[model samples]
Target: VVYTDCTESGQNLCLCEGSNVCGQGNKCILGSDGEKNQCVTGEGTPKPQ
Candidate 1:
């Protein structure tokens, strides 16, 4: 599942899967085994959100 940061806008944009699942301008960050991942801004072809 994806986990987003707590922001006033309702959601901050985050991911708990793989980089391939990230959207445009965002990339998945690898975390601990079985732990949730992170999606941050980056350079690459992004997927639909």
Candidate 2:
């Protein structure tokens, strides 16, 4: 799964699991590997309710 895909709606798809399942060019800036699930970017950040 890609970071953009997750940010698209901030649904359950963004949940990073199993050593990170993010798509290419994806990084765990907001969280850590297996420590968090939110994905961050180089530009604006996504805020979830």
Candidate 3:
């Protein structure tokens, strides 16, 4: 799994998951409430539809 910061699309992959569910060098950016199954990066700011 590879996640990118939603804020900028291309940013530093925040190493905080600890388990590293996402592959190396990849970040986890969460989706909006509609996307509960999505991951999050940095602050996980909800996106608008």
Candidate 4:
């Protein structure tokens, strides 16, 4: 997981949360460490489920 392309289309996941904000079907979610806000899927913080 790295910095995201910063798209509102939610095509990119696991983006630099604080640096990359999200829209549409995506949102900046908490990272695995629950510190950084990663631009991720609407599901948010998903890798196990």
Which number leads on lDDT?
Answer: 4
Considering lDDT, which of the candidate structures 1 and 3 is the better prediction for this target?
1
Candidates in order, TM-scores: namely 0.30, 0.23, 0.23, 0.30
Best-to-worst ranking by lDDT: 4, 1, 2, 3
After superposition, candidate 2 runs with Cα above 4 Å error? 1-20, 29-35, 42-49
lDDT of each: 0.40, 0.39, 0.35, 0.43
Put down candidate 2 lDDT per residue, 1-49, tens digits, no spaces: 2433344422332444334544334443334554445544433223243
Candidate 4 residue-wise lDDT, 14-47, digit = tens: 3445554344355454444754455555644322
Q: Cα deviation in Å at residue 41, candidate 3? A: 11
Clashes of each: 0, 1, 5, 3
Q: Would you give me the overall lDDT of model 3?
A: 0.35
Candidate 1: regions farther than 4 A off? 1-21, 32-35, 44-49
Tell me how far the alpha carbon of residue 21 in candidate 4 is from the true structure, in angstroms, after superposition: 2.6
Check candidate 3 and list the clashing pairs.
3-27, 28-40, 29-39, 30-39, 30-40
Residues 1-49 of candidate 3 have per-residue lDDT tens digits of: 3543334321234322343343234435444455422334344322222
